[PDB]
Design a protein around this ligand. Structure first.
Ligand SMILES: CC(C)=CCc1cc(-c2coc3cc(O)cc(O)c3c2=O)cc(O)c1O
Ligand SMILES: CC(C)=CCc1cc(-c2coc3cc(O)cc(O)c3c2=O)cc(O)c1O
Ligand SMILES: [Mg+2]
Ligand SMILES: [Mg+2]
Ligand SMILES: [Zn+2]
Ligand SMILES: [Zn+2]
Lengths: 323, 316
């Protein structure tokens, strides 16, 4: 079983990794083994003098703080977003654009970006007067919480994977991770996409053909959109992966809708199991959210993401054909 | 003693209220007695069916969560900002332009806007890796905490002063209070002033959209927060003595930690008088001159600020 796990992890640079199989083969430790594999692949332990036992201890504590009883926003989602960000960071149009610290920030941000997610949305938490929404003044409630937990766990015993960064490196990494995870709030999607479109329309490329990003605002904008694309990458994956993700988010959504219905609340979009059309909802999700975002990312890195976009478009056609 | 307190509160509608006297005669309850007076002055208990016992219970609990061992950011500052907003709200040029709910929000936001303040700055909390900064991801750390405490206290026994607001009214009030208190973060001052300037350049004599009206309310409570240099000099000097005690204690902690000492916090290299002229020239007067242009009613306030700047300059 360890042999089969190791073979599957050889695919870590590939879009469409068998992440659900890795979750099973690793004993429900997909986030730990995928993060460890990616850190070895990118030589991040050596670069940042991360002790291996510290990395594994932190990753296993981080993974523990995802909820195994939440169908979608769990450690497998986190592992998937990590691995998807890792692939997007390797795209030819971004070669040697980002520093090792920025790479570390994007991957760490992906790993923590949904930690301790309770399986209900920000609006649900706001409208039910939850303790989380009271703490965070109704503003990026979940995303602030994910950051606070992900950083606080670094202070547990033998968990500070950043123990050997300089003070300036720690300060820069913390700021970038915050900026990235806050951009995963879906209420920011339209403004994030609008800004990404502006960047594509005005983009500059170097003599080597890679993207030119010469200020923090542009650099962090690209990393924010990269992790947001990774977060919204399920419809761009091979259909058997996409369908499993859809089964899971519909389970989580319907359970939130059941709580809304029981409380006499208006049921959130896609959350009413009695008035649901999963197929129509996926075509709409792709048409109005996922394809506008990914076609813009594809333009930013053209032609690198053409196969990903093609898969998205094929999956949209497949779902539409079932209507 | 109770009779003298009642007579001091007769000036609740005037700039320059004797708030330190009121703090003394109240048994250190200036926030509770001044909020109660202003609520009764504005008929807010009957209007929002606020049980008077519930108002008092909430106010006393809120006041208890201001730190009595913090020289400036305490319940007397809260009471002063409440009363200053109350005076700015009754500006003739703003007559009947805000609803009773928005008035409630501006006054409530002022009352809670610094609650549970530890007497050190956001940058201090960030650079010391505090629990507060870990909770709030280095972003408006104190202001987010002030809001969270002020609202959480409504859930204590017999403290829900908004119990008879409709569900929509509570949602709207909550949003406006958050928008206002988050705007008291001093790192937002320049952007807030820039937008107030844009509003003055386009002023109609009248704010039609919520964006503009919340912007005025944000700037109004920010002016009230930065109103000490516009008060009668005897009050302003007391406020300056208090904030310099708080600043010097923070700078002592920064020095001992080996941190950069924040502006005005190094007692061994301080000039309080030069600091005040700089504070007025670069922050307070540009803000209040813009406000006075918006309400062109604030002339007596701006005059006092300019008088006080002239005096502090003369002490150099
Ligand atoms: C359109 C509205 C109201 C909200 C956007 C929104 C969408 C998702 C989401 C994520 O991953 C999916 C994966 C699938 O495979 C299928 C899916 O449908 C989804 C989703 O829907 C999660 C949100 O938290 C959220 O806000
Ligand atoms: C210049 C920097 C670094 C920060 C500006 C800044 C200034 C104050 C402040 C408030 O009320 C005062 C009252 C007085 O009577 C005299 C005073 O000097 C002050 C002040 O200075 C409070 C801040 O929270 C803050 O950030
Ligand atoms: Mg999320
Ligand atoms: Mg404050
Ligand atoms: Zn996510
Ligand atoms: Zn204040």
């Amino acid at each position: 079983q360890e042999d089969v796990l190791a073979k599957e992890l050889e695919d870590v640079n590939k879009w469409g990794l068998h992440v659900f199989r890795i979750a099973e083969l690793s004993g429900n430790r997909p986030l730990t083994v995928i993060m460890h594999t990616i850190f070895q692949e990118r030589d991040l332990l050596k670069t940042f003098k991360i002790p291996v036992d510290t990395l594994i201890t932190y990753l296993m504590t981080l993974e523990d703080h995802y909820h195994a009883d939440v169908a979608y926003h769990n450690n497998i989602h986190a592992a998937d977003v990590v691995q998807s960000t890792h692939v997007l960071l390797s795209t030819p149009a971004l070669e040697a654009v980002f520093t090792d610290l920025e790479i570390l920030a994007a991957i760490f941000a992906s790993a923590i970006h949904d930690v301790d997610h309770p399986g209900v949305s920000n609006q649900f938490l706001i409208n039910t007067n939850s303790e989380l929404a009271l703490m965070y003044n109704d503003s990026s409630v979940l995303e602030n919480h994910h950051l606070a937990v992900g950083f606080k766990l670094l202070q547990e015993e033998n968990c500070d994977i950043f123990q050997n960064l300089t003070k300036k490196q720690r300060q820069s990494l913390r700021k970038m991770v915050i900026d990235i995870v806050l951009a995963t709030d879906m209420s920011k999607h339209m403004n994030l996409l609008a800004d990404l479109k502006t960047m594509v329309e005005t983009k500059k490329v170097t003599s080597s053909g890679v993207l030119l990003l010469d200020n923090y605002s542009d650099r962090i904008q690209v990393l924010q959109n990269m992790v947001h694309c990774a977060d919204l990458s399920n419809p761009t994956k091979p259909l058997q992966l996409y369908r499993q993700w859809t089964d899971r988010i519909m389970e989580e959504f319907f359970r939130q809708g059941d709580r809304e219905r029981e409380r006499g609340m208006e049921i959130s979009p896609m959350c009413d199991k009695h008035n649901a059309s999963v197929e129509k909802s996926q075509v709409g999700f792709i048409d109005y959210i996922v394809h506008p975002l990914w076609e813009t990312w594809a333009d930013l890195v053209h032609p690198d993401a053409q196969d990903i976009l093609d898969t998205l478009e094929d999956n949209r056609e497949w779902y539409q054909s079932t209507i």
